[PDB]
Ligand SMILES: O=c1ccn([C@@H]2O[C@H](COP(=O)(O)OP(=O)(O)O)[C@@H](O)[C@H]2O)c(=O)[nH]1
């Protein structure tokens with residue numbers, strides 16, 4: 001039985017939020033003892049999964065770099081399985097994987113609107129968790145493909161349910177957050193409520209918890225469709241609603257998904273992952 005004090009030291013980063021009102025640590029560089037955690041999880045022989053979708057030109061623009069960086073930085077020292085979801089397997093970049101890495105690849109149907117491509121991921125992930133992921137890993141992370149690992153993204157990020165603080169709003173007040181504000185939407189979060197603004201580019205936890213996250217989020221996505229409304233930030237709006245109602249047991253600082261367009265302020269000590277520059281004119285086909 002692992003105890004928070006065994007690996008997490010919030011006093012190492014006193015200038016930032018390291019603990020939520022419901023506890024749950026906010027993992028910042030310097031606060032975690034990866035050595036302790038690696039030993040602990042290794043003795044449990046855990047396996048970590050990672051899902052990533054690449055539909056359309058996202059394949060050529062980002063899949064190879066994402067996979068290459070993940071192979072080098074994601075849960076090094078532990079068995080990892082990459083679940084690649086593409087609409088065209090013939091364009092699948094097959095890179096050489098290193099020790100403790102392996103993958104499988106699935107062909108999925110490409111949604112017409114990029115907004116649905118992004119949102120339908122919630123449905124697909126759920127189907128795969130029930131079909132096989134629940135039997136193959138102990139923890140699973142679901143990520144956007146348009147980003148690249150820059151440094152070790154390890155076991156210090158594992159937990160029941162894990163959320164990512166969005167790089168651009170981590171210092172803002174809830175009323176500034178771009179939550180969906182229309183009551184007609186299932187993702188609606190009224191002003192006066194909210195803890196943080198989570199990035200949908202990264203989320204995870206145990207297969208069971210991620211299954212519930214994706215389910216619920218997808219149900220909200222379907223509900224909105226029946227009410228002829230679409231959340232402002234699509235799956236992200238819904239994810240934030242979910243995490244408001246079901247608090248994550250662990251949150252990652254913006255160091256784990258950083259936007260260099262912001263520059264590199266004092267709080268961001270060591271970047272583990274960074275956003276790829278947006279290229280919508282090429283990778284997206286509809287407004
Ligand atoms: O045409 C599309 C739209 C989205 N995606 C996937 O859905 C995620 C969400 O999209 P995007 O990264 O474009 O969202 P943004 O972070 O720029 O809001 C992407 O990382 C991809 O994994 C995709 O493969 N093809």
Ligand SMILES: [Mn+2]
Nearest residue numbers: 144145146201
């Ligand atoms: Mn993205």
